[PDB]
Design a protein around this ligand. Structure first.
Ligand code: FES
Lengths: 72, 146, 62, 336, 53, 229, 64, 230, 248, 51, 144, 62, 66, 149, 40, 89
């Protein structure tokens, strides 16, 4: 979260901002696909570690959507 | 009970429910259980082997042990209380619930046609001298071996 | 219902409020009005609460 | 600040529900109530964030000093209505309210029905007046009318006293929310009066239900009947509560009903007549038949465990509620 | 018994497992006959291993 | 041999690494003795002059357990029915003072009279009420929620819901007394400084290697129990 | 202050002696309860007088 | 004024507790610094006299108490009374008052009920010249004057025992019941057996006097053997 | 290495100076705290060992006892034979009469052995088992006798060899217990003739009790150093891996 | 109030009280932790405000 | 050392390192978070010693190089640092204890086959291989 | 002896039973001492014997 | 859907009231409560548990036009 | 704000005072003091060491004893020789950190990043438009750390 | 349950001591113990 | 608020849906919170349960900064804005 996620966000915001016109479509498609595919899976966990991982994944997807908004 | 005044207490031996079980070492062991107790509870009290019992009976509220099973019940939480019942005992038990079947289907180890959850099994007077087998249930997480 | 008497107005009500059983605890009987919104234990004003017997024993042992 | 304060009440309600309710089924009820309240809060928060971002100011005067576009005003109005109706409650987002009133503790349900709905209505009214909208309020009016009709129609099938009281409260809330649909017109006074009357009536009904569940240890009519024969004061109080809930002319419910019906008939006469036909008769008949069957009879069941009469605390509470409902009509008309 | 974990000491011998545990037939056979194999005895476990193979 | 001045009686005594386990908020009287594999629940109150010998078999004591004074509890190692011969107590059991327990089962919400004896194999179910000065015949099952008395005990009458609620409330009553008693003792024992230096204390006969100290890292652990050894 | 329990009541009937002992015990229990309540109220008054000012200062600094 | 005095007493107790805790912690830290093992001595923390905050026990010096006895909380013991070895007197709930020259057997547990109805006190009141057998279990009782209690006798809450009464060993005075004067009670369900006799009463009084003398002799032996405090 | 020299010097100074000064300061502070909290508090006392109380001329002879509890009370003229066991919390007051405990004689926990008379000889035979929480009053119990937990042996009871008094039973005064006879109930009456299986079970229980007493005495007779070492061993076992156990 | 040092001292006292209470141990234990935590919290708060 | 740092923003070591105020602030924040987490982890370790020296060494080594990623100025250095971090993560995963002290006495003559550690290792290794191949292909294409 | 203060002897002290295994070893002496020099020589001889090429490639190259 | 006029035996497996864990008893009016009628309990806990059997059967249930 | 005299035993305190919280300056910004040698080599930096670096090393060595003691407090079941070796290694690491800090301070002084007894001919005039800390630091110890407020 | 003090001290409870009388003589060999408190 | 300031209605709707799903998933765990009695999940040291006072203090500080930390959001927001100010500068 602190290193990899922030590095990816900065790469999509500060490093490769000149190509943000192309990253927007891919990011939006990935976010939509994740929102559509993970919602069904998020309601069938039966392990505490799996629940923690699912919370982390949901937070990552939300942060990805936030970064997509920020790139505008 | 309907116990009257002055009557002596009843010996627990008259209420002993016998379960002959095939343990993973292929061993025929006889366990004694009390009426109303879950199969998982009886196994834990008798220190039976082969049952991982990851969920430790699952949820404590609206549990599958309540009769009738509530529609808002969450069902089993693991796939470790797998016990294969005998033909008469399984026939008397009936058909597994929707959640029971859904959970038993998603099991790493192969299951049998008479496989039921020990935590979902309730002690009934009809289960005297009941035959059960306990194939080695799977181990799921890093804390399962702790 | 004919024999019922909650406040003991029509029939005498013992201070013990029960006849203790030979094998049951002599716990307090449940009041008809279970209002738990009761104020602090009120003692009469200017009440001597000093341990008189303990003070006498202290004087004796000293 | 208004939005933050409106959002804080959810945590105390969830804490009370999770730790004070005696019912075992109340866990799922609390979860559903929390979920619905959070959905309404999310809708309201989206609307508030849109409003704040549109005009970077935090004053209603500054909001009035700005004009929103057509799409912006439509979206803001729709989102505010959706959030407030999920918190009203409104059909078909009333399952949470139904389950809560079915399972929650008596004190919490009395407070939850009495206060939270009024707070949500007040927030919706405050936000709606501060925003000028050129759209047609037909959607909101129809939603309120349909919710009132649905709540009133289900009364005849409710054997649980708490469930019937919840249905009546839902109908009253829908009727109240119907009033403020005319914008900043002269409809707020009727809505406020109806909200006060509904709060008092719901408080009385919840207190009666709590007293019954404490005395007869039940909430369904099938196991408790003939209350007046063993509990005369309780039966008289129930009869008086039914009379008050009938919108009797002396009660403030009559004045609020008159104002609301006058406004509706001025807008839609046939719709006003239909609304008067359903709630005042059908739902009222159902509530009375459910209440009357328990009011009278002969409680032959459980002779050795019969309950006692109402305590002086409950009697004083009922007297205070009746006094508020009656004397509240004598307030100065400068505000009404 | 010191250093034997939950295993305790009886009157006519010492246990090989926890209290109220399952006495494994293979463990007893190994302990009694150190290396004696009178025959390849066909036990339930042996049959299960053969069936698995 | 047995000649000494300062008694060495230790309430918590392990036997061949069979260390007892103690839960939270528990009040173990310093005059009591606990030897053997005994797992006590959270907030359990053990009175003084009581002995719990978990040697023959382990003993599980519930959370809201209230053990009276002069109570002797011990296991048998084996039961006639072959069932687990260990003492097991439910969640909230109020055992009367000067009682005898010999590898018997007590379910939750149990009330035991003072001077009562529960022999081997006996099982008191939930809600059970056993009167004072009674003897439970070995290998007998007390009906759930039943008030029974006698020597041997006989079923007297079924307990009411009000009686069960009153008993449950009485179980919760000892919490304040236990908290006060725990607050009475200091976190650090003061008996050590009261003695005089000895030859062995000044001159160690043999030296041992330095390992993880018995109180290693104890700085970061809160001293919840003042009676900690 | 005379402890009737620690008094020579051997000159009366057993029932009367028991009643007098009960009265003395009631008076002593009332005194003990009153003293205990007087001490217990201090468990609230001292903490109320102690942390009120600090709590007010901290909350005010946090808010305004 | 009383509230201020109680607050001052509580503040003094808290300050003393803080000072004692700081001193003990400093001593343990120093023992750790000097590589000493005296601070971790597994000495028992039991105390024969437990002052429960304000509930300070009070007993005249004429009384004999075995070191194993456990008197906790508000207790008020008369002069020359003898307490058996390991006997417990729990005064945490209510006061426990005892008359002078009374003998309590070893492992005798006297306590109080949490609450009761009006007319029956929650304080354990015991008269003078009484004898209580070993294993006795007294709860919230009022026993008057020279009573005789056999071995392992249990008096329940609300019991009122009159003067000159005899209860044989292994008996139980029921809850809220009255033991008649000059009569012998038998059975766990206490039933009147026979009226007390002059010879029996004299023998009981002599036995109580002998128990007091034996307690005095035991105290004398313990004082010499340094097994008795003060 | 100047680093190692400085470390040694600092450790020496810190120990040899702070230990005394800080220890004295802490002792003074503890004394002040104990003084301030008075009188509404209590302090730790040196608990006397009631296991060897000698009255005038009566001195216990319990050196041959295999198990003597740390918290038990042994006061007066009581002589025990080899293999004798007295469990925790028992009270044997020999002031009220001489006590003759036989060999392999087990007196369980919280047992009150007190003579009803001021001078009477209470004589227990060899291999005599007594149950916990019992009350014995100056009796003559022969060899191989069994008394259950919570039993009440009256003043005049005379038990023959291999006689069983069931747990919770109260023998009346002046009762003669026959051999191979088992009695039970609050009014003790001869219940049944003991079968060989029951006698074997009782003997096995007695032997197990003797062995447990031996183990406990091996445990109960530990010194301060032994107790500290055991605690340290438990702590190390709490952090010793499976490889550590294999290496051990 | 207004002083960052006073606010930090109050915060430290409250934190010590809360930590002691949540530990289930009785209050007035380790009194040296009270002034130390108060000073530490006051310093931390003043430094945070200046930063 | 970072607190006392001063200078001008430029490229370091043949333009392979980026030394900017934002990068320094990010490194400082990462270090502070790592220090707080390490304090918490040490406090937890003092409770029960369920972790070995190797896991702590792997964590320390990961923490040694983790802050350097913020100073990357080129995709080659970023790829190398990310590969190093992935290797450190795999090493830390290998440092997990396979067996634990449990009171499960019934399993003393039977074998329990747990595949959690092997599955974790296989998944991590395959994902790391695929990601490294993709990143290398991306760098090679971007350079051209 | 024992500086008995009230009830606590201010001179009570128990020598620790736990100490270093190599507490009195020759190598444990201060660096540069004759015993330390001999112990260091023995340790260096052992290290050179066990790892000869390693020691050469490390120190000689350094 | 309608009730069966025929006599039926007392219910055996029907939804029954369950108390929350550690529920403090409400001892109003002396805590004098009796055993409830099984049929009454089943009827009380009937609507909250009733559900449709087949998908789409909700439409034709009762009166289609209504 | 005044600066501790350069080449003294307290020159490291100047590294604890900064005008702004900026970690680095701009590419075109003039240094606070004159620059002696921007093109500094390792040998030049070594030659630039002085009493400030010596005092920094001494302070690191002194403070290193408490840190080493704290580190050693967490070691259990270890030999005295092992504990002494670990403590010596920790102290050596602390001394190395102090030497590195001294070298960095010398490099900054040669580059003019910190005070080195030099003042530019024409001072850079900066107007503090946003000044919410002048009063705050003016009545506390925060002024002693802010160079020129 | 109720935890208040029943034996109040602010006033005296008016009690009729003649309503119930405790038996004190001629008890049967199996008779039950009389009630200690009989004030109404 | 940032998404609205950036005029992303579709992003706002998707974030709201995701937040609702996450709230439901997280609250689903609160159903299993209830237990029939007090549990025992604390490790035992020296025969008694050991509670880490330092961990308790850290948890108390975190709970304080979470329950009432919303009011103190100004300083954190200012610090983050200052950090991000030099990102492009
Ligand atoms: S406990 Fe999980 S399958 Fe039953």
């Amino acid at each position: 979260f602190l290193i990899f996620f922030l590095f990816f966000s900065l790469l999509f915001i500060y490093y490769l901002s000149a190509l943000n016109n192309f990253f927007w479509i891919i990011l939006l498609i990935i976010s939509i696909i994740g929102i559509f595919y993970i919602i069904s899976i998020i309601f069938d966990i039966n392990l505490f570690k799996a629940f923690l991982a699912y919370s982390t994944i949901i937070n990552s997807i939300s942060f990805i959507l936030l970064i997509i908004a920020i790139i505008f | 009970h309907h116990h009257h005044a002055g009557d002596q207490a009843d010996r627990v031996a008259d209420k002993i429910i016998w379960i002959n079980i095939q343990n993973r070492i292929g061993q025929f062991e006889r366990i004694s259980a009390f009426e109303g107790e879950s199969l998982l509870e009886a196994l834990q009290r008798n220190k039976v082997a082969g049952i991982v019992a990851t969920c430790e009976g699952g949820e404590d509220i609206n549990t599958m042990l309540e009769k009738p099973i509530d529609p808002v019940t969450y069902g089993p939480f693991c796939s470790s209380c797998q016990v294969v019942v005998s033909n008469p005992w399984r026939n008397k038990m009936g058909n597994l619930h929707y959640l029971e079947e859904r959970n038993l289907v998603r099991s790493s180890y192969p299951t049998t046609e008479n496989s039921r959850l020990a935590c979902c099994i309730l002690v009934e007077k009809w289960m005297n001298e009941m035959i059960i087998s306990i194939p080695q249930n799977p181990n799921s997480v890093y804390e399962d071996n702790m | 219902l004919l024999k019922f008497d909650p406040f003991g107005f029509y029939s005498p009500k013992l201070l013990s409020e029960n006849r203790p059983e030979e094998a049951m605890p002599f716990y307090e009987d449940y009041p008809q009005n279970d209002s738990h919104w009761n104020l602090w234990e009120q003692f009469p004003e200017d009440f001597e609460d000093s341990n008189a017997e303990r003070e006498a024993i202290l004087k004796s042992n000293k | 600040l208004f939005f933050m304060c409106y959002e804080l009440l959810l945590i105390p309600s969830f804490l009370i529900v999770y730790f004070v309710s005696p019912s075992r089924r109340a866990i799922q009820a609390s979860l559903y109530f929390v979920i619905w309240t959070q959905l309404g809060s999310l809708l309201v928060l989206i609307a508030i964030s849109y409003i704040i971002s549109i005009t970077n100011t935090y004053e209603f005067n500054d909001l009035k000093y700005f004009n929103f576009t057509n799409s912006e005003s439509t979206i803001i109005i729709f989102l505010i209505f959706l959030g407030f109706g999920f918190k009203a409650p409104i059909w078909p987002f009333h399952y949470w309210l139904t389950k809560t009133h079915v399972e929650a503790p008596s004190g919490f349900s009395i407070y939850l029905s009495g206060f939270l709905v009024k707070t949500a209505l007040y927030g919706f009214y405050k936000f709606n007046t501060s925003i000028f909208i050129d759209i047609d309020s037909s959607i909101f009016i129809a939603i309120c009318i349909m919710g009132v009709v649905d709540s009133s129609l289900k009364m005849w099938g409710q054997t649980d006293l708490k469930k019937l009281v919840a249905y009546g409260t839902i109908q009253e809330m829908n009727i109240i929310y119907l009033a403020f649909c005319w914008g900043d017109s002269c409809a707020i006074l009727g809505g406020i009066l109806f909200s006060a009357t509904h709060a008092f009536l719901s408080a009385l009904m919840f207190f009666l239900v709590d007293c019954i569940y404490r005395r007869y240890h039940t909430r369904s009519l099938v196991e408790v009947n003939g209350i007046l024969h063993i509990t005369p004061n309780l039966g008289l109080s129930i009869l008086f509560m039914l009379v008050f809930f009938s919108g009797i002319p002396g009660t403030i419910k009559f004045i609020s009903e008159f104002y609301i019906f006058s406004g509706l008939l001025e807008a839609s006469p046939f719709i006003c007549f239909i609304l008067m036909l359903v709630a005042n008769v059908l739902g009222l008949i159902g509530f009375s038949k459910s209440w009357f069957n328990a009011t009278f009879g002969m409680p032959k069941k459980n002779t050795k465990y019969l309950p006692m009469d109402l305590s002086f605390k409950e009697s004083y509470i009922i007297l205070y509620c009746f006094f508020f409902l009656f004397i509240f009509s004598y307030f100065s008309s400068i505000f009404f | 018994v010191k250093g034997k974990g939950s295993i305790r000491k009886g009157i006519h011998g010492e246990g090989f497992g926890a209290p109220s545990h399952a006495h494994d037939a293979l463990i007893h056979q190994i302990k009694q006959s150190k290396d004696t194999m009178d025959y390849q005895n066909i036990t339930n476990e042996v049959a299960q291993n053969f069936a698995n193979h | 041999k047995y000649g000494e001045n300062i008694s060495k009686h230790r309430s918590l005594m392990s036997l061949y690494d069979l260390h007892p386990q103690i839960g939270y908020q528990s009040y173990i009287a310093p005059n009591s003795t606990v030897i053997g594999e005994v797992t006590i629940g959270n907030e359990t109150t053990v009175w003084y002059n009581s002995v719990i010998r978990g040697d023959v078999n382990a003993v599980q004591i519930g959370n809201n357990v209230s053990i009276g004074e002069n109570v002797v509890i011990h296991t048998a190692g084996s039961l006639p029915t072959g069932q687990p011969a260990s003492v097991d107590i439910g969640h909230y059991v109020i055992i009367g003072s000067k009682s005898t327990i010999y590898s018997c089962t007590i379910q939750d919400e149990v009330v035991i009279g003072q001077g009562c004896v529960i022999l081997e194999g006996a099982r008191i179910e939930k809600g059970a009420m056993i009167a004072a000065n009674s003897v439970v015949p070995p290998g007998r099952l007390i009906p759930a929620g039943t008030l029974w008395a006698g020597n041997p005990c006989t079923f007297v009458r079924n307990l009411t819901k009000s009686e069960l609620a009153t008993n449950i409330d009485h179980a919760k009553k000892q919490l304040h007394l236990a908290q006060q008693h725990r607050y009475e003792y200091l976190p650090y024992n003061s008996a050590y400084l009261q003695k005089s230096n000895s030859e062995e204390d000044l001159n160690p006969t043999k030296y041992d290697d330095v390992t993880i100290n018995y109180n290693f890292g104890d700085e970061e652990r809160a001293q919840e129990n003042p009676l900690k050894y | 202050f005379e402890n009737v329990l620690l008094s020579n009541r051997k000159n009366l009937t057993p029932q009367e002696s028991v009643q007098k002992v009960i009265n003395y015990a009631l008076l002593q229990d009332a005194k003990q309860r009153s003293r205990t309540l007087r001490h217990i109220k201090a468990s609230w008054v001292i903490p109320a007088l102690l942390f009120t000012y600090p709590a007010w200062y901290l909350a005010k600094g946090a808010v305004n | 004024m009383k509230l201020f005095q109680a607050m001052w007493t509580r503040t003094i107790y808290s300050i003393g507790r803080m000072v004692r805790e700081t001193g003990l912690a400093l001593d343990r830290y120093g023992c750790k610094l000097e590589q000493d093992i005296s601070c971790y001595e597994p000495l028992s923390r039991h105390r024969n006299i437990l002052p429960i905050y304000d509930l300070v026990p009070t007993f005249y010096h004429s009384t004999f108490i075995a070191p194993n006895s456990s008197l906790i909380g508000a207790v008020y013991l008369g002069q020359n009374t003898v307490v058996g070895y390991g006997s417990t007197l729990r005064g945490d709930n209510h006061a426990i008052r005892v008359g002078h020259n009374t003998v309590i057997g070893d492992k005798v547990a006297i306590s109080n009920v949490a609450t009761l109805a009006a007319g029956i006190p929650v304080s354990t009141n015991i008269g003078n010249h009484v004898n209580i057998g070993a294993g006795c279990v007294l709860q919230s009782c009022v026993v008057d004057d020279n009573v005789t209690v056999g071995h392992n006798t249990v008096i329940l809450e609300g019991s009122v025992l009159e003067r000159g009464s005899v209860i044989a060993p292994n008996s139980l005075v029921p809850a809220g019941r009255l033991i008649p004067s000059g009569q012998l009670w038998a059975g766990s369900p206490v039933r009147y057996v026979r009226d007390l006799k002059e010879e029996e009463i004299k023998l009981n009084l002599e036995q109580t006097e002998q128990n007091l003398s034996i307690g005095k002799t035991h105290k004398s032996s313990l004082i010499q053997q340094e097994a008795y405090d003060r | 290495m100047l680093r190692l020299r400085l470390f040694d010097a600092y450790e020496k100074i810190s120990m040899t100076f702070l230990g005394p000064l800080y220890r004295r300061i802490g002792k003074s502070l503890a004394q002040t705290g104990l003084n301030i909290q008075q009188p509404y508090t209590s302090d730790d006392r040196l608990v006397p060992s009631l296991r060897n109380i000698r009255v005038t001329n009566k001195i216990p002879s319990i050196n041959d006892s295999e198990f003597i509890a740390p918290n038990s009370v042994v006061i007066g003229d009581v002589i025990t034979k080899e293999g004798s066991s007295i469990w925790y919390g028992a009270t044997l007051r020999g002031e009220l009469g001489p006590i003759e405990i036989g060999k392999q004689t087990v007196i369980q926990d919280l047992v009150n052995i007190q003579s009803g008379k001021q001078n009477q000889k209470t004589q227990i035979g060899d291999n005599v088992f007594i149950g916990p929480n019992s009350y014995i009053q100056s009796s003559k119990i022969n060899d191989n006798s069994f008394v259950g937990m919570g039993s009440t042996v009256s003043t005049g009871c005379n038990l023959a060899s291999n006689a069983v008094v069931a747990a919770g039973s109260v023998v009346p005064e002046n009762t003669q217990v026959p051999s191979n006879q088992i009695w039970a109930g609050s009014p003790a009456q001869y219940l049944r003739d003991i079968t060989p299986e029951e006698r074997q079970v009782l003997q096995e229980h007695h032997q197990e009790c003797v062995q447990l007493a031996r183990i406990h005495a091996e445990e109960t007779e530990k010194s301060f150093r032994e107790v500290l070492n055991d605690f340290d061993r438990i702590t190390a076992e709490a952090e010793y891996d499976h490889e550590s156990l294999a290496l051990q | 109030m207004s002083s960052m040092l006073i606010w930090g001292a109050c915060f430290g006292l409250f934190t010590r009280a809360a930590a002691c209470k949540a530990s289930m141990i009785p209050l007035t234990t380790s009194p040296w932790k009270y002034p130390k935590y108060m000073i530490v919290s006051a310093v931390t708060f003043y430094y945070f405000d200046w930063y | 050392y970072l607190i006392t740092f001063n200078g001008y923003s430029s490229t370091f070591w043949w333009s392979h390192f980026k030394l900017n105020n934002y990068s320094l602030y990010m490194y400082l924040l990462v270090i502070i978070f790592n220090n707080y987490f390490l304090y918490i982890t040490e406090k937890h370790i003092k409770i029960l010693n369920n972790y070995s020296i190797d896991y702590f060494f792997s964590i320390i080594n990961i923490t040694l190089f983790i802050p350097m990623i913020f100073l990357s100025n080129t995709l080659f250095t970023f790829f190398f640092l990310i590969e190093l971090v992935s290797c450190a993560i795999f090493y830390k995963f290998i440092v997990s204890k396979i067996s634990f002290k449990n009171s499960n006495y019934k399993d003393n003559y039977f074998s329990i086959f747990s595949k959690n550690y092997l599955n974790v290792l296989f998944y991590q290794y395959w994902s790391s291989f695929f990601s490294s191949v993709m990143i290398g292909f991306c760098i090679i294409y971007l350079f051209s | 002896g024992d500086f008995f203060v009230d009830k606590y002897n201010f001179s009570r002290r128990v020598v620790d039973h736990r100490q270093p295994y190599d507490l009195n070893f020759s190598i444990n002496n201060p660096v540069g001492s004759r015993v330390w020099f001999k112990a260091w020589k023995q340790k260096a001889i052992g290290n050179f014997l066990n790892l000869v090429g390693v020691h050469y490639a490390f120190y000689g190259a350094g | 859907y309608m009730g069966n006029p025929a006599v039926q035996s007392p219910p055996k497996e029907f939804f029954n009231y369950h108390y929350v864990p550690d529920n403090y008893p409400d001892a109003l009016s002396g805590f004098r409560i009796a055993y409830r009628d099984p049929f009454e309990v089943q009827h009380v806990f009937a609507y909250e548990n009733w559900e449709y059997q087949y998908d789409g059967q909700w439409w034709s249930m009762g009166s289609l036009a209504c | 704000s005044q600066t501790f005299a350069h080449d003294s035993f307290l020159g490291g305190l100047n590294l604890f005072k900064r005008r702004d919280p900026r970690f680095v300056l701009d590419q075109g910004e003039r240094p606070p003091y004159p620059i002696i040698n921007s093109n500094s080599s390792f040998v030049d930096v070594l030659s630039n060491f002085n009493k400030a670096d010596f005092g920094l090393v001494l302070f690191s060595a002194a403070i290193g004893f408490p840190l080493s003691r704290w580190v050693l407090k967490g070691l259990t079941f270890s030999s005295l020789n092992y504990r002494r070796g670990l403590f010596s290694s920790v102290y050596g690491g602390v001394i190395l950190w102090g030497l590195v800090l001294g070298f960095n301070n010398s490099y900054y002084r040669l580059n003019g990043f910190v005070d080195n007894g030099l003042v530019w001919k024409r001072k850079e005039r900066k107007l503090n438009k946003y000044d919410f800390t002048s009063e705050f630091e003016d009545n506390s110890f925060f002024k002693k750390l802010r160079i020129r407020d | 349950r109720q935890n208040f003090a029943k034996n109040i001290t602010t006033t005296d409870i008016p009690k009729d001591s003649h309503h119930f009388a405790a038996k004190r003589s001629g008890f049967t060999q199996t008779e039950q113990a009389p009630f200690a408190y009989n004030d109404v | 608020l940032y998404s609205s300031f950036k005029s992303q209605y579709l992003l706002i709707l998707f974030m709201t849906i995701l937040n609702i799903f996450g709230m439901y998933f997280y609250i689903q765990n609160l159903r299993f919170v209830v237990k029939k009695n007090k549990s025992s999940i604390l490790n035992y040291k020296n025969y008694y349960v050991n509670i880490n006072y330092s961990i308790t203090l850290n948890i108390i500080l975190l709970n304080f900064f979470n329950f009432f930390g919303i009011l103190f959001l100004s300083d954190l927001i200012i610090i983050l804005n200052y950090i991000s100010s030099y990102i492009y500068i």
